[PDB]
Amino acid sequence: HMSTPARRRLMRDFKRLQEDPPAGVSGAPSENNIMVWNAVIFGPEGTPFEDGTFKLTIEFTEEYPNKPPTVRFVSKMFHPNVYADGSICLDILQNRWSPTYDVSSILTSIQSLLDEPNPNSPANSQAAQLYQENKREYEKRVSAIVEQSWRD
């Protein structure tokens, strides 16, 4: 759509993602609603999430880009900063959002978060406990959800 500054900016976000995506990310507006996007993030290489293909949804309001969207994993996730319902604790989504961030930088930020959990936001208490105390078992759990992410 093109009727509002938020919509035109989202279309520019979409253009950047089509023609120049960061490694391992994709996103597109939903067919009927430019405010709701579907996105995919590949787990970062050299991390337990490598080979994962994780679907997410992103919901915008007309305040975008001055207010961050809400982002949720749709794929099953096992990560200290991700709630059971897919909600994500990411500082640029909660505390230091900037209108200069776009869909691309949100997706790469979540990607980076997969590699480096924030110890301040233990949304998944078992994931934070294993990450803190038992990396082998943490990665076994992540491997499970990597394999599950190959199934919608």
UniProtKB/Swiss-Prot annotation:
Phosphorylation at Ser-121 by CDK9 increases activity towards histone H2B. Pathway: Protein modification; protein ubiquitination. It is found in: Late endosome; Lysosome. E2 ubiquitin-conjugating enzyme that accepts ubiquitin from the ubiquitin-activating enzyme E1 and transfers it to a E3 ubiquitin-protein ligase. In vitro catalyzes 'Lys-11', as well as 'Lys-48'-linked polyubiquitination. Together with the E3 enzyme BRE1 (RNF20 and/or RNF40), plays a role in transcription regulation by catalyzing the monoubiquitination of histone H2B at 'Lys-120' to form H2BK120ub1. H2BK120ub1 gives a specific tag for epigenetic transcriptional activation, elongation by RNA polymerase II, telomeric silencing, and is also a prerequisite for H3K4me and H3K79me formation. Changing N81S: Abolished ability to transfer ubiquitin to UBR4. Its main location: other. It comes from the Eukaryota. Coiled coil: none annotated. The gene is UBE2A. The modification Phosphoserine is found at S121. SMART domains: UBCc. Interacts with RAD18 and WAC. Interacts with RFPL4A and CCNB1. It holds the Pfam family UQ_con. It is linked to Intellectual developmental disorder, X-linked, syndromic, Nascimento-type: A disorder characterized by significantly below average general intellectual functioning associated with impairments in adaptive behavior and manifested during the developmental period. MRXSN features include dysmorphic facies, hirsutism, skin and nails abnormalities, obesity, speech anomalies and seizures. The active site is at C89 (glycyl thioester intermediate). One of its GO terms (molecular function) is ATP binding. It is an enzyme of class 2 (transferase). This is Ubiquitin-conjugating enzyme E2 A. One of its GO terms (cellular component) is lysosome. It catalyses: S-ubiquitinyl-[E1 ubiquitin-activating enzyme]-L-cysteine + [E2 ubiquitin-conjugating enzyme]-L-cysteine = [E1 ubiquitin-activating enzyme]-L-cysteine + S-ubiquitinyl-[E2 ubiquitin-conjugating enzyme]-L-cysteine. GO terms for biological process: chromatin remodeling; DNA repair; G2/M transition of mitotic cell cycle; positive regulation of mitophagy; postreplication repair; proteasome-mediated ubiquitin-dependent protein catabolic process; protein K11-linked ubiquitination; protein K48-linked ubiquitination. Residues 5-151 form the UBC core domain. The keyword Nucleotide-binding applies. Belongs to the ubiquitin-conjugating enzyme family. Keywords: ATP-binding, Chromatin regulator, Disease variant, DNA damage, DNA repair, Endosome, Intellectual disability, Lysosome, Nucleotide-binding, Phosphoprotein, Transferase, Ubl conjugation pathway. InterPro entries: Ub_conjugating_enzyme, UBQ-conjugat_E2_core, UBQ-conjugating_AS, UBQ-conjugating_enzyme/RWD. Changing R96A: Impaired ability to transfer ubiquitin to UBR4. It comes from Homo sapiens.
